[PDB]
Amino acid sequence: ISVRGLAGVENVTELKKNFNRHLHFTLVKDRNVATPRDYYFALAHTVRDHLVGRWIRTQQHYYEKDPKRIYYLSLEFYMGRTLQNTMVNLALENACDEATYQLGLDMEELEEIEEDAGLGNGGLGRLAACFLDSMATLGLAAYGYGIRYEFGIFNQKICGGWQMEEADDWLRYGNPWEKARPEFTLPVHFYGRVEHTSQGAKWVDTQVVLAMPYDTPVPGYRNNVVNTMRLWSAKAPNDFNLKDFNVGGYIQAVLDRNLAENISRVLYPNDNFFEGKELRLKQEYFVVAATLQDIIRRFKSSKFGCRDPVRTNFDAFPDKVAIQLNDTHPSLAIPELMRVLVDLERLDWDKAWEVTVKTCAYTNHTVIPEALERWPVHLLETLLPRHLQIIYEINQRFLNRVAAAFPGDVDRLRRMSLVEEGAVKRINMAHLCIAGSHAVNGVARIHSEILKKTIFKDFYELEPHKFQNKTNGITPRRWLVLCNPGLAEIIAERIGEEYISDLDQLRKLLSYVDDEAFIRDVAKVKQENKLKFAAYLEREYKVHINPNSLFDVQVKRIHEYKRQLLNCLHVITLYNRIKKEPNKFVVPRTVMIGGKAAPGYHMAKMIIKLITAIGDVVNHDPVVGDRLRVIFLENYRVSLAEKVIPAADLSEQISTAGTEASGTGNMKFMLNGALTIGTMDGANVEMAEEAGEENFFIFGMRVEDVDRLDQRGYNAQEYYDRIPELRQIIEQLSSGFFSPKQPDLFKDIVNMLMHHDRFKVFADYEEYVKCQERVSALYKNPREWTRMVIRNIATSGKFSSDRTIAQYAREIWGVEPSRQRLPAPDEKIP
Amino acid sequence: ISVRGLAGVENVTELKKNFNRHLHFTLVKDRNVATPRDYYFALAHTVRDHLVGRWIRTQQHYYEKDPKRIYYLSLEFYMGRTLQNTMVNLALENACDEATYQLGLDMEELEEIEEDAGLGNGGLGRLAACFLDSMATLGLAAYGYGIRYEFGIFNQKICGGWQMEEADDWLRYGNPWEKARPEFTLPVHFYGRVEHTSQGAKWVDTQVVLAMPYDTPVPGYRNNVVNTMRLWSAKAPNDFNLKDFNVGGYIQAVLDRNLAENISRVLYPNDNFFEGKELRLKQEYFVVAATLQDIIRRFKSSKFGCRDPVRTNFDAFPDKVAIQLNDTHPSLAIPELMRVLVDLERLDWDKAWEVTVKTCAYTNHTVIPEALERWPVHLLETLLPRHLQIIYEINQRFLNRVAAAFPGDVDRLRRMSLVEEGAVKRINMAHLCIAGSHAVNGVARIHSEILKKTIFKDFYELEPHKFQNKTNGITPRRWLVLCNPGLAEIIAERIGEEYISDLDQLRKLLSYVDDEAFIRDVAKVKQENKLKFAAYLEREYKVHINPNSLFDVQVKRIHEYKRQLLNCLHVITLYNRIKKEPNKFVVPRTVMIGGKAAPGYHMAKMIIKLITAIGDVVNHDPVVGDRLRVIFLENYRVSLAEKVIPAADLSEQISTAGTEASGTGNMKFMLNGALTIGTMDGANVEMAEEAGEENFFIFGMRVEDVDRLDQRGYNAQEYYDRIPELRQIIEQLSSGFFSPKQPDLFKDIVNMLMHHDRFKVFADYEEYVKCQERVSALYKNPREWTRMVIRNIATSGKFSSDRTIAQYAREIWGVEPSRQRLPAPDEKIP
Ligand SMILES: CN1CC[C@H](c2c(O)cc(O)c3c(=O)cc(-c4ccccc4Cl)oc23)[C@H](O)C1
Ligand SMILES: CN1CC[C@H](c2c(O)cc(O)c3c(=O)cc(-c4ccccc4Cl)oc23)[C@H](O)C1
Ligand SMILES: *Cc1c(COP(=O)(O)O)cnc(C)c1O
Numbered sequence A, B: 001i002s003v004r005g006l007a008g009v010e011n012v013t014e015l016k017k018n019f020n021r022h023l024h025f026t027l028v029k030d031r032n033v034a035t036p037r038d039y040y041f042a043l044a045h046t047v048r049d050h051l052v053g054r055w056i057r058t059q060q061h062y063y064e065k066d067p068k069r070i071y072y073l074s075l076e077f078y079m080g081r082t083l084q085n086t087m088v089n090l091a092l093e094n095a096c097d098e099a100t101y102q103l104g105l106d107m108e109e110l111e112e113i114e115e116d117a118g119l120g121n122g123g124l125g126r127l128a129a130c131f132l133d134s135m136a137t138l139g140l141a142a143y144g145y146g147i148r149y150e151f152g153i154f155n156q157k158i159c160g161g162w163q164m165e166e167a168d169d170w171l172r173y174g175n176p177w178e179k180a181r182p183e184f185t186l187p188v189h190f191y192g193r194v195e196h197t198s199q200g201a202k203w204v205d206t207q208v209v210l211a212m213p214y215d216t217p218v219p220g221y222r223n224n225v226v227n228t229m230r231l232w233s234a235k236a237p238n239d240f241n242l243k244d245f246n247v248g249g250y251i252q253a254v255l256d257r258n259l260a261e262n263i264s265r266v267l268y269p270n271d272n273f274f275e276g277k278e279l280r281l282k283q284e285y286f287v288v289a290a291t292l293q294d295i296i297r298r299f300k301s302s303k304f305g306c307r308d309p310v311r312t313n314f315d316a317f318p319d320k321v322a323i324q325l326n327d328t329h330p331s332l333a334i335p336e337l338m339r340v341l342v343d344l345e346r347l348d349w350d351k352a353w354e355v356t357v358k359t360c361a362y363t364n365h366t367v368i369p370e371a372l373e374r375w376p377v378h379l380l381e382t383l384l385p386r387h388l389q390i391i392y393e394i395n396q397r398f399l400n401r402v403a404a405a406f407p408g409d410v411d412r413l414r415r416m417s418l419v420e421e422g423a424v425k426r427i428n429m430a431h432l433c434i435a436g437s438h439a440v441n442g443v444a445r446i447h448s449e450i451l452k453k454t455i456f457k458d459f460y461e462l463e464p465h466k467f468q469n470k471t472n473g474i475t476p477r478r479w480l481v482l483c484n485p486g487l488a489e490i491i492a493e494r495i496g497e498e499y500i501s502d503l504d505q506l507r508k509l510l511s512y513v514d515d516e517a518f519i520r521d522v523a524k525v526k527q528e529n530k531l532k533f534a535a536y537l538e539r540e541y542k543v544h545i546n547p548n549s550l551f552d553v554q555v556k557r558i559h560e561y562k563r564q565l566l567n568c569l570h571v572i573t574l575y576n577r578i579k580k581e582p583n584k585f586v587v588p589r590t591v592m593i594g595g596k597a598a599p600g601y602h603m604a605k606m607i608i609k610l611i612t613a614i615g616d617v618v619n620h621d622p623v624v625g626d627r628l629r630v631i632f633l634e635n636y637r638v639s640l641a642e643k644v645i646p647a648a649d650l651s652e653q654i655s656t657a658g659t660e661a662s663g664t665g666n667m668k669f670m671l672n673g674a675l676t677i678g679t680m681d682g683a684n685v686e687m688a689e690e691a692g693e694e695n696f697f698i699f700g701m702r703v704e705d706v707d708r709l710d711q712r713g714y715n716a717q718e719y720y721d722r723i724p725e726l727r728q729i730i731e732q733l734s735s736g737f738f739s740p741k742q743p744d745l746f747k748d749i750v751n752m753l754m755h756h757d758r759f760k761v762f763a764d765y766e767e768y769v770k771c772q773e774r775v776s777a778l779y780k781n782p783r784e785w786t787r788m789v790i791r792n793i794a795t796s797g798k799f800s801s802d803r804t805i806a807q808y809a810r811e812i813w814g815v816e817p818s819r820q821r822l823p824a825p826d827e828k829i830p
């Protein structure tokens, strides 16, 4: 059937009875009233059973051996579905496929019932998920810590061509994967005030909110390692949240508990955008405060909570603990670690600071200013009074270091301060992170260089040793084996299975680039994937597409910097050219654009409307026929990505040079047989460098060109004046050609393009359409298109998150990865 | 060990492995980190497994045979713990005891970990629970329908002698007994308006709230029948509760979902008191609206949803459905049934009314005015516009019936109206219930008579056939076998086990009233129970009591009508007499008073303080020694009742004659070997009648005496003037003898007693203390005290809820009870 594992005789039999056990005893149903959802659940519980044994021994193992622990703090974990991924990592896929088949059920049908765990916005959250998978596969004692939102990223609906948001009630039917651990609930404090008494400061009169943990297992790839992802949920205490007496109403008090519990209610749906709301700050401290208590508790046990030098010497803390800050969201971990060490453990400031810096590391994800977290001092002042004091003290000591290093450089002083003066004083969380971390890394070579040359230039000059680079990656399990079994199979047929946990081995495929059989196969799986997607499209969304056309797709969050607008200009250009010479042959294309817009991002929502507006015109023009279709992919999310990416021919990665720190969707398309048209931005640079620029479709300005244009001054009118095709498009938009009933509907888009385009869409237009013409030429030559595809696939090995994690491990955490199988799962009950 | 079932070799072995299965796979724990709570859960899941098989076949059975279904609607189900009760009804207690013993665990220790399901205030909620147990034991196709409150009755804490309330987060660690059934979620409507169009009225522009059901199994006593209790939970839809667009904030919209969900958040903590709050009305409609949809859906299937006369003829509705309204709380079921039949099914009014009346029956629980539900018309007008219209129409037609029956009786017309004029117009829910039900019953003979003679005299004259009586009862399983195994054993030793489901057989014990062995035994188990309680007291609450004294207990909700105050007067009298003649012998007593006060009931809270204030003085007077202790039993609830009742010697049932409709605590004490001191009120009358007044300690005014006093006019001063002992007590309270630091602390109590005592505490004082002297005399004669106890126990058979349910079944529902064992639980998987 494929290499989804063995369908053993004893195990298929064992699976079936357990499926039946759960359907009866767990779901309390009988075959005569069970629905597909019930069957999905019976299966999930059956699969979940297989890793608890391993989960228990893995955690017991770490307790015995006591290795250095890695704590990955993130406010986002974009997990997606977990049934298939679990089967894959446990080598259960075929056995399960067989067992459900014999029970008369279609496993694929049941998998579609699982709800996505959408606890993330996009790239940042998905990276955390890929990292968790790699850390387990590399046998690291790692823990993912976050927040268990009861409502994840909103489900996107398109009404009248506009995006409608609706709550993502992903827990509605329950989550079979998590395990509530109410016995490990921890208290988190808010508000209050600081008392300075005799021997130290005291944080007093605080409001208490409880943090209840929920654990989800993270299985490594076929190595019997099962790590833990601990997500915190907010709960109101039953006392004060009722006991603070003297009238108000007993009923009201109880109803008001959903005020403390709102902290973990919903994920902020902003991608690369900072919104300074109090609720967000509460969420950030909540995850940090609870996590750190858990980390220290575990440490106090270790082998120090037995003997060792005897005397809680936190001198060894950094030798046993590593905390990775995914962006600045969990930045309060730095002043919180100090607070605990100084205020509670009573360590001297300098010793505490030494420990803090040595255990914390920070990962920067973007350079755009509106993504930068700058919290108003009055907010921190009211909510976290002691932390503000600690931050001022950290700032004080840091600036003294700067002054000593650059005597008289007064402007440098204000530039590096963690405190920004002005309208309202604010705290720069990025500066906080750099000062309190021993390592700061960018997510792609170009991005890391930009950090040193621009945004954090002063900090790099002060401590060059802190700055590093760790190019992002994606997990080959979910992003190849899981979503593209067909491709994984033909690759395995030639080079074996060892590449699944050693992607570099994909290079061996280079020697099949002229193999007639392989070329035919690679091309066949892509055709099958396209036919499958084309069917899914009519199944769940309904309105046909041609599977013989070039599948041109751009899927990612809607952003001005991502330039979905540039894509739109090209689509309209294609349309206008066909209308000019109807009977001229052009390579048929199905351009698919999908992605969610943050609810308050007006321009992003306007772009979605433009996309659907273009499709309304183009898709119903008889003269165009099936040569051009414009489709907006609704509710783009992890599970949808697993469907479109394997079906794509052309991957659109066209952000303005210097704006996309790295990107990861780009890597997903490369691994799945799509060719890339993009700018020299983020990881694109490293991808072209790995495959050879001749096997990549690069166009547009480079970072330097953008800077040159800025010195000069960007004037869109110029491009409008010199390019007739461009002029024609802008006039079509302006006149209502794409919005008959509301002729001025797109005035904001046009106005922006012409007068305030921070991302110079027009500047890359000419080179973009020219490059697109080259893609079409090559597509007309199936054999050569496929050969270039093989060159990309064979050279994508570097982009596996296993490589990324191995680098973090060695160059930042100080731990050694290992591909050693944990001593089987075997029963055991001590 | 006792007759808690057989500890079979194969089953104890089977139990142990399943306990281990659950500890490993379900709880994901290993013996090295498992805590008593984990062990309790492993056991609960193991026991829960044993009834799913039966649960499934019972429900399948009803589907095949299609008997008339009984729907018991109640806003309260005071269930308590369910582990032990399940073991008892499944005959698993000994096997489980053995198995956990071999696993090295103390089953009794684990049982204490289970949280009470306190979804009720007291009597009314506990009655619903006893009824569910009896209906299952009598093989009735019955369903209990209610609301799944996430917060039940508050946990009571005594601080400084005052009651403090704190949220009852009973779901904190999860509920192993329930099964969420999200697939059966139903929508409930609120607000909106009524459109009268061509062919009928339409309820439009409503706000939708979803009702998600949770099912809990209700096992019958050893007959393999497992019925269902379906509790509804409120959930906000994901659309409109987000989709009603045009600014406000996406985040806010999501947070605002906890506005629709507040409906099932908390139980109103009022016992026999009406609070006209909108949230309460919403709860009442919520349970009614969801339940009725479920009832009709099931009906449409039956055997009509196959063939029969073919044509949804609701003519057979009353032949297949019976809806019992537990008090007026679910009264909206009447106009809701009409709404559905008329507005949706399009039946003519008269046919719909015929069906409604024939399927509905109402149970009245009290005659006190402040418990009467009178909803303001403006509230129903805004929240349920169509129901108000239907109620006016029902009223209209009903009054026309009255006018035709009593021509010219204009005052009768206004008296019987469902609409009350005055300050604000209100709807009398009790009148609604009588008009739309074919049966109305009181809960004890005297209460039922009072209803016909007073409160509902006009209605009784109109339709005498509607009025009935159904004396309350308690289940002998939980209230004897479960809480008093020792007593159940010695009884079984002489007459067998058949009495557990046939309490009348207890009469056979009369022939052992002179048996020397039995007398010694009955007395021994009572002594063991007392020693056990006396230990529990120091264990969990700490401060010693003497197990050799007479255990004088009054446990029930704190009320002015229940007269805990009268008890207080007696206690103070005892104290004053000892202080007067210290060296005179008196029978030692431990008087225990426990019960919760509604949070807003000031007087009730003042009484609790008085009780603790008396104990402060009495318990620390050296001269008193161990002859008199006054203890306030904290957090009285079902699980605590299971502990004190079996340990009691004297049961205090002293409400003012005519105020306690029935009472059930009184029956619990009679069954467990306590003698009763009480007034001729509620069921007390029937209890004395069953045991013989010579074996009961009756005192005080009868209903007639109370009425006589009212004609005359009650003047407390008179009693104050003629009874020195009483005068001395009132002056002690007035002067601060019991509240040194706050001398006027009890001025409200004294003022009330002297000027506005609606319950004439003083009028029964003399006869009360005189009667108490008779109890002490008899206690001094162990042998005779015990012989009187045997006369009470042997004659309590009539008070089993099996008898009550058998009467409801035959005289109201039209179904025949059956003690036939359902065809085993045996595996099966169709
Ligand atoms: C001037 N104004 C433009 C819109 C912007 C804004 C909003 O008002 C609301 C939003 O939800 C977003 C968002 O999600 C991303 C970005 C963003 C992110 C990176 C680069 C450029 C931009 Cl415009 O901007 C947002 C902010 O008010 C400043
Ligand atoms: C005059 N006033 C007295 C208090 C009463 C009241 C409250 O203000 C608040 C409450 O929670 C209760 C309660 O639980 C029971 C009874 C009650 C019930 C039956 C008979 C007599 C009484 Cl007093 O009364 C309550 C109401 O405001 C009328
Ligand atoms: C991989 C992924 C992303 C990130 O895509 P980029 O193109 O790097 O912005 C966003 N959303 C989902 C659903 C993803 O799978």
Ligand SMILES: *Cc1c(COP(=O)(O)O)cnc(C)c1O
Binding pocket: B121, B122, B123, B126, B555, B556, B557, B636, B637, B638, B641, B662, B663, B664, B665, B666, B668
């Ligand atoms: C039985 C019971 C009641 C009812 O007691 P009465 O004395 O009839 O008022 C109230 N609360 C609990 C916990 C009960 O078990």
